[PDB]
Design a protein around this ligand. Structure first.
Ligand SMILES: CSc1cscc1CC(=O)N1CC(C(N)=O)C1
Ligand SMILES: [Zn+2]
Length: 140
């Protein structure tokens, strides 16, 4: 589990969105595994606006933050989990790192701010849904 809190937005994995998220929906995209809902309180996270390929992510199944090198956001075919079939997920970045299903939620960050959240993985992989192209998260 986990979310990004920027401005009056809450960014979560679409497959972990709650009823309150769907009832206060701003935007969702199943191909990216992302959903954004509105919040009453302002958040403290800042979104990175950069092309970093190195950063650090949080792994809840190890209670640890790991430094990683990650690929550029791309269209990557994903093994069908409990929420999606085998499929192509867009705007996904891969890195070598431990992950288990509950880890969806964990932030990947660089020196500029939040880069994305954990979304897919396995066998020492972990995939992050990028958010750096969602410029509207910084306004309104
Ligand atoms: C970090 S996800 C992961 C680590 S080991 C196996 C998995 C894969 C998994 O169970 N999925 C991916 C997620 C989705 N986006 O639907 C649900
Ligand atoms: Zn950066």
């Amino acid at each position: 589990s986990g979310a990004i809190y920027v401005g009056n937005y809450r960014v979560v994995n679409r497959h972990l969105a709650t009823h309150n998220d769907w009832a206060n929906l701003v935007w969702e995209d199943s191909s990216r595994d992302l959903l954004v809902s509105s919040t009453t309180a302002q958040g403290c996270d800042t979104i990175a606006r950069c092309d970093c390929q190195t950063g650090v992510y949080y792994c809840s199944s190890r209670r640890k933050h790991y430094p990683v090198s990650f690929s550029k956001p791309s269209l990557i075919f994903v093994e069908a989990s409990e929420y999606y079939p085998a499929r192509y997920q867009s705007h996904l970045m891969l890195a070598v790192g431990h992950s288990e299903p509950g880890d969806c939620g964990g932030i990947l960050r660089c020196q500029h701010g939040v880069v994305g959240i954990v979304s897919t993985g396995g066998n020492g992989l972990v995939g992050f849904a990028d958010v750096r192209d969602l410029l509207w998260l910084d306004e309104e």
